[PDB]
Design an enzyme around this catalytic site. Sequence first.
Site, PDB file in Angstrom:
ATOM      1  CB  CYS A  84      -0.878  -0.048   1.260  1.00 45.68           C
ATOM      2  SG  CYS A  84      -1.976   1.387   1.300  1.00 45.68           S
ATOM      3  CG  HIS A  87      -1.278   2.874   5.305  1.00 50.26           C
ATOM      4  ND1 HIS A  87      -2.489   2.836   4.675  1.00 50.26           N
ATOM      5  CD2 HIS A  87      -1.404   3.889   6.202  1.00 50.26           C
ATOM      6  CE1 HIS A  87      -3.291   3.771   5.141  1.00 50.26           C
ATOM      7  NE2 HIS A  87      -2.656   4.428   6.065  1.00 50.26           N
TER       8      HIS A  87
HETATM    9  C1  HEC Z   1       8.571   3.578  13.265  1.00 50.04           C
HETATM   10  C2  HEC Z   1       7.865   2.433  13.888  1.00 50.04           C
HETATM   11  C3  HEC Z   1       7.791   4.803  13.188  1.00 50.04           C
HETATM   12  C4  HEC Z   1       7.175   5.498  14.204  1.00 50.04           C
HETATM   13  C5  HEC Z   1       7.217   5.182  15.689  1.00 50.04           C
HETATM   14  C6  HEC Z   1       6.527   6.660  13.591  1.00 50.04           C
HETATM   15  N1  HEC Z   1       6.682   6.698  12.212  1.00 50.04           N
HETATM   16 FE1  HEC Z   1       5.953   7.993  10.883  1.00 50.04          FE
HETATM   17  N2  HEC Z   1       6.606   6.885   9.378  1.00 50.04           N
HETATM   18  C7  HEC Z   1       7.452   5.794   9.453  1.00 50.04           C
HETATM   19  C8  HEC Z   1       7.749   5.235   8.132  1.00 50.04           C
HETATM   20  C9  HEC Z   1       8.669   4.049   7.728  1.00 50.04           C
HETATM   21  C10 HEC Z   1       7.053   6.011   7.272  1.00 50.04           C
HETATM   22  C11 HEC Z   1       7.047   5.853   5.767  1.00 50.04           C
HETATM   23  C12 HEC Z   1       5.884   5.067   5.254  1.00 50.04           C
HETATM   24  C13 HEC Z   1       5.963   5.017   3.753  1.00 50.04           C
HETATM   25  O1  HEC Z   1       6.259   3.991   3.186  1.00 50.04           O
HETATM   26  O2  HEC Z   1       5.798   6.044   3.120  1.00 50.04           O
HETATM   27  C14 HEC Z   1       6.366   7.031   8.036  1.00 50.04           C
HETATM   28  C15 HEC Z   1       5.680   8.100   7.478  1.00 50.04           C
HETATM   29  C16 HEC Z   1       5.130   9.161   8.213  1.00 50.04           C
HETATM   30  C17 HEC Z   1       4.434  10.293   7.650  1.00 50.04           C
HETATM   31  C18 HEC Z   1       4.050  10.461   6.178  1.00 50.04           C
HETATM   32  C19 HEC Z   1       5.216  10.991   5.360  1.00 50.04           C
HETATM   33  C20 HEC Z   1       4.919  11.273   3.894  1.00 50.04           C
HETATM   34  O3  HEC Z   1       4.105  10.590   3.286  1.00 50.04           O
HETATM   35  O4  HEC Z   1       5.524  12.179   3.365  1.00 50.04           O
HETATM   36  C21 HEC Z   1       4.142  11.114   8.632  1.00 50.04           C
HETATM   37  C22 HEC Z   1       3.304  12.391   8.529  1.00 50.04           C
HETATM   38  C23 HEC Z   1       4.633  10.488   9.850  1.00 50.04           C
HETATM   39  N3  HEC Z   1       5.226   9.269   9.591  1.00 50.04           N
HETATM   40  C24 HEC Z   1       4.493  11.031  11.109  1.00 50.04           C
HETATM   41  C25 HEC Z   1       4.811  10.378  12.332  1.00 50.04           C
HETATM   42  C26 HEC Z   1       4.576  10.930  13.689  1.00 50.04           C
HETATM   43  C27 HEC Z   1       4.233  12.408  13.968  1.00 50.04           C
HETATM   44  C28 HEC Z   1       4.906   9.924  14.577  1.00 50.04           C
HETATM   45  C29 HEC Z   1       4.928   9.905  16.016  1.00 50.04           C
HETATM   46  C30 HEC Z   1       3.571   9.842  16.598  1.00 50.04           C
HETATM   47  C31 HEC Z   1       5.361   8.810  13.758  1.00 50.04           C
HETATM   48  N4  HEC Z   1       5.326   9.095  12.391  1.00 50.04           N
HETATM   49  C32 HEC Z   1       5.874   7.661  14.293  1.00 50.04           C
HETATM   50  C33 HEC Z   1       7.849   5.196  10.655  1.00 50.04           C
HETATM   51  C34 HEC Z   1       7.473   5.586  11.959  1.00 50.04           C
HETATM   52 CU   LIG Z   2      -3.064   1.089   3.133  1.00 49.33          CU
END
Ligand code: HEC
Ligand SMILES: [Cu+2]
Lengths: 99, 250
Positions: A84, A87
Amino acid sequence: IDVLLGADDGSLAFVPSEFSISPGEKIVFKNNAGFPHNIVFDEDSIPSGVDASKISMSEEDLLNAKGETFEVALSNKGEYSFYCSPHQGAGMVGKVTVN
Amino acid sequence: YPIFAQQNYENPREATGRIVCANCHLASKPVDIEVPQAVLPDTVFEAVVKIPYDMQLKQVLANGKKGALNVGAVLILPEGFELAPPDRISPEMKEKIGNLSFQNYRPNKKNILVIGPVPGQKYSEITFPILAPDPATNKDVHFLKYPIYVGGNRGRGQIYPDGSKSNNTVYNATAGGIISKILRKEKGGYEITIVDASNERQVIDIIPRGLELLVSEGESIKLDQPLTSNPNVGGFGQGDAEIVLQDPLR
Ligand code: HEC
Ligand SMILES: [Cu+2]
């Protein structure tokens, strides 16, 4: 075979995520929970010569309503890795083997 | 994503004071939060979080293509404070919050709110509608100065919840030696063969698409030496504010 996009507890995962199918068998991906979702096949992780545009949704296309489905039938044998797009980092990935 | 921290971290703030998004979101970038100096009991106020970044930046999407960044945040409020209900949110404030869905970190944690992923071009600054509690209707809430913690992230993370790296991070050599071959793959990605002459061992490091190599065939590489450029243009940052639950008298 029917595959749920998002588990019944709201988990971001394909159910099932790893499965095997016969050639020409249809896979019905249905939006279940945690949408929007989409199904993209990894162009570098499918059998050689297969066009990923013929069996996957565009990275910009999304299923955003409960019950929306995307159906696809694979014929070439081998392993197909899909995910996905929004995700993929969540671990919402899967692999199907056509045997 | 905010769901990965909620799915395997009961509380988002660790004992060091670092928010759990920094475990996968490894680049540090500034986050800001403006909150009113003092608020009255049972009144709605807005906590605006700013997650600023150069908007001409394009990150490597999960399929190798380059695209825009998405934003997400986690607001940690004191116990008693919670998301303001829809009947208490003004119309001048309802257009400000756009159409965002603030979720509770967990159904028992009503004082921790998470939002995202939402598109960065539209939500670099987010407004959280919070309802201040009332000490006359809550015996553990008092007229005091309360700490507010925020975690803001923009861009894709580097590590997944199983420990696997994403294609938005640096790929390091798993062995030292000399690169004897670099196979550029058909649909993108690379296969680098390293001949560890010191251990008489041959290893093949695979690099995903969306990343460009920094090494050439015949070059000597050291263990953990970066074989590709760092494609991460996003980052996570945290800030804190202090709010005074004020007595309506003096
Ligand atoms: C590791 C287990 C993670 C934790 C804990 C948090 N995030 Fe994360 N985030 C992670 C990955 C590997 C990815 C990429 C997913 C993909 O394949 O695209 C993300 C992505 C985000 C995003 C979207 C980024 C984008 O599309 O440009 C955001 C907005 C984001 N993550 C925010 C976020 C916040 C605020 C967290 C703490 C509550 C958080 N993540 C934890 C991995 C991990
Ligand atoms: Cu999905």
